[model samples]
Target: HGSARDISSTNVTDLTVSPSKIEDGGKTTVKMTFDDKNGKIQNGDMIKVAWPTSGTVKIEGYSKTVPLTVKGEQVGQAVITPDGATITFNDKVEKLSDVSGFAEFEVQGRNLTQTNTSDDKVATITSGNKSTNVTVHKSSSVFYYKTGDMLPEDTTHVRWFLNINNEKSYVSKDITIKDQIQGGQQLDLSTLNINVTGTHSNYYSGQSAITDFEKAFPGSKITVDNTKNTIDVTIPQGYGSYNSFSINYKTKITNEQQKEFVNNSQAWYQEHGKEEVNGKSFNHTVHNINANAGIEGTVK
Candidate 1:
């Protein structure tokens, strides 16, 4: 009965990932060592690595096929998908007693969801019945600038969110933020607000995590200048450690022909005695649907 024990999940160990933390679209390598002495993980036997339904990862390259190496020799290929990858063996893994080699491949982060409170996600790798979890981060932990239209159903108004400085990176002197509204939209001056919170990232307007700038950081001064189509924010010197800041504002559609609204913004700061600036361009489109003579069904 022990001639070919048929490698079980217990035979695989030491799952590892490099550069575990990545940007929105980034790459990472995954490796796992196996010991299949006197056993054969024969053809059709598969090893799978998967993420949650909300998040996904893909193997490197568009083809979704990566070389599978064992003991530093290519034996087969790993078939990849948006949710995960499955490595089916072609070579019978037998007499591989030592963990001196691995079956590994590279994968890229895809649609790894991140939020204000958390920016990291988890993945699971299974070989037969044994499974273990691994972690991947969204790289927004340090610093990142992004803008998006959170609510798309509201055709009359578009809300723009600018999230920045999630890790509270130091600024030597001061910070400045300038935003401009493009297309046939008018800036809603009354809705211009910036909130600071240490416990959250990407916090937006009307969100629960909003905090007063002065209360969050003593001696820090924030000033805002609102124009007909633009808004400017200034943070003077003499502040302590920086956390995260979220700028949220709304623009009203003034013309129906434009079809799209563009919001461009920039952030300026002094980091380690040097001046640095980050900018982003975001846009949103509105779709007007009309039903003239489509199929209609009624149940009696």
Candidate 2:
């Protein structure tokens, strides 16, 4: 129609994003691949992609649009706003037939928060007419375990949550997570439960109330070792396809007299799976003072 043309999905083809799961205030690499489906790409053709409202282009001045230069001279232009972006080409992909062009860049997600009851927020990405989604986690690390100091209303059990990160990444099938208790605590084998969210390679749908850890992770096993005061959960190999493994369990507090309790845990995988384990400690103060209700006329 005009001197320049806007690209469409037929021409854009496919869009691939790396580290599709990103924490808030984090960046991800978007690799775009284009091909000529309708006709030959002209010299003035333009391609565009859309990001979530919290997404930014991450460049000079955080501007909506900036001049794209090859060597020292401006050859094209790119405009990225909070909502979407457009990249105008001049000579890079000019007048090419069956072109396989790539536009790889890092996009930042700012101040993203989880929605509903989920631990992560999913955002849609649009390139031309094609669409995809990315997971924005609420926490900084994708894989982690945590606990609160509340000690619950029961006052005898401490809850632990181990969140396994498998969004758009491959995790070994037979990975294990071990928790060690200090200050007199032990794993409650009866309270152990596993829940899986999102789409999984093994499971057809999201599963909850799963008491069988071996069933969720086929060919895996679990152990509640009282001798070492630990709980070990081992998973099978090839666990992937954006499934989230949420391990929930309770540890019985044996030492009510202790004001403070310590706990630590780590995840184990194959030789490639060496990482510094992050742990947590809790404090539950106990006092031995009580007041009685009676007629206190003599106090005045």
Candidate 3:
């Protein structure tokens, strides 16, 4: 009875385990093993584990806990791409007043592409999809002069200069030398309003204006006879051009007053007379008297 009264008690040691770390949006694996030297604990023994809430924490079983950290830089990068544009010109364009048709481009954003380009005068890309219009204008200078009485073989050469531009760029091309008249409605000598200025006499004749006007107006025809000096113009119903037209006349006179008709002439014949002026050996005599004039019109 005296020996059994001295028995003592033993304390069990505490167990410590570390949690696993994983990047935000990333994954990790964890495993745990238990050490029970005395074999007192059985497989059914319960174990508890916990982790802070800074990230996602997953616990598979006893002694296993994965801590997934939540960071701000986990999102993937974005990409952008751009496509080329297409341009189309309208069928009809006659003058500076006419519209220069529109242009369009197919654009897409991706990881590698950027911007597009074109002849600015034809069109311009203002934003992603919208475009700015271009204006087709004629030059202020006159192309050439033709004598009213000269035949087609005697027609003088004139050069027309064209210039078109937009907010960003410009383009220019010359009129075919064979096709000089820009645009207009063809008319007969009776319907045309012929005006002469400076010291010149009568214009060449109806033949001169007729041929030149035909080249410019194409299918047009003379429709009205306003007077012996004026002719009315009639163009084809649907004829059109990219640019508009302008007609300017300038003349010069060389013959002195004829005493026979001086009384009733009223200076009409003296002011309106026409002669060969632009060719070689051009002179100011009655037979050689010449007048220089120009006609401007649009072409679509």
Candidate 4:
């Protein structure tokens, strides 16, 4: 909101945002309304406001800048910072006075679901020391991986998940999950399966949620490269999003198996099948060389 003008001054009196509570990827518009009794916030007077300044925030499709135009006039300036965005319009005020104008922008939101998140929903709008505050809220998102130990029968298993609206945004691109086993652990691709559930709190090594992961995310499936002892999964783009979901699979133990499992996992957010890339560009690294490993035959 812009600073208040005295009844005699007659000026802009309101500032608001469309769809005040922001989503993972959305466009927000800032509107400043005006009236006749105004001394400042007119003509050459500035109308500056700050916006969420997170690196994840992209002005919708724009790379960095968000535009605020007042008729043929250009709002003073816009500065982007990790703290938030600050936009100033010192000269274009009265130029576009007759109309209630607005500026639209979007972002990838922030990565903090543990608290209220960054930015106080709204920011300050001021010209010099006269400042007004607006009310706006932000949300977050995230996803990643983990694994367990070798089964008594020598079957290896691991667990991982994609958490929506957490530390990262939900981007149902092509998600490929890969796990490589060393020390002679053979992968049983058919044993690959997943459980999509609402809670991960009471997770145990021997259970799964109601819905099969493939049942929730169509076109999504799993695969294996036995020649190399690797188990993999492909999450198609249509899976849209979920609060959270987990995947767990078993591996066949080979006669050459050791007490420890040298295993690693990765999740790629880009399109295309590149699970093998996990061999080098691993996202979640693991060590299963001894019997004292995670998940005691499963992913912990």
Candidate of highest lDDT:
2
Compared with the true structure, what per-residue lDDT tens digits does model 2 show for residues 140-227?
5555444543221244666666666544345544556776666566766566666666665332222333444466656666566766
How high is the lDDT of residue 7 in model 2? Answer: 72
Candidate 1 residue pairs in backbone clash: 168-242
Each model's lDDT: 0.51, 0.54, 0.21, 0.41
Q: What is the C-alpha local distance difference test score of candidate 4?
A: 0.41
- Highest TM-score against the true fold, candidate: 1
lDDT of 4 by residue, 148-235 (tens): 5322122244322323222223454666767666654565545544544442222323323223454544676655577877667676
Tens digits of per-residue lDDT, candidate 1, 65-124, equal 556555465554555554555655554333232322354555555444553234335555
Q: Mind giving the per-residue lDDT tens digits that candidate 3 earns over 1-300?
A: 122110001111222222122222221121112222333222122222122211122111111112211132111111111221111111111121211111111111111111122221122212222223222111132222222221111212211211111011111322221111211112223223332222221232343665655554577443323232222233331222233222322112112222110000000000012332222211111122121111111232
Q: Single out the weakest 10-residue window by summed lDDT for candidate 4.
A: 291-300
lDDT of 3: 0.21
TM for every model, in the order presented, reads: 0.40, 0.39, 0.15, 0.33
Q: How large is the C-alpha RMSD of every model relative to the true structure?
A: 17.1, 24.0, 38.4, 21.9
How many residue pairs collide in each prediction? 1, 5, 53, 29
Candidate 4: TM-score? 0.33
Candidate 2, after superposition: displacement of residue 100 in Å? Answer: 84
List runs of model 3 lying over 4 Å from the truth: 1-209, 222-227, 250-300
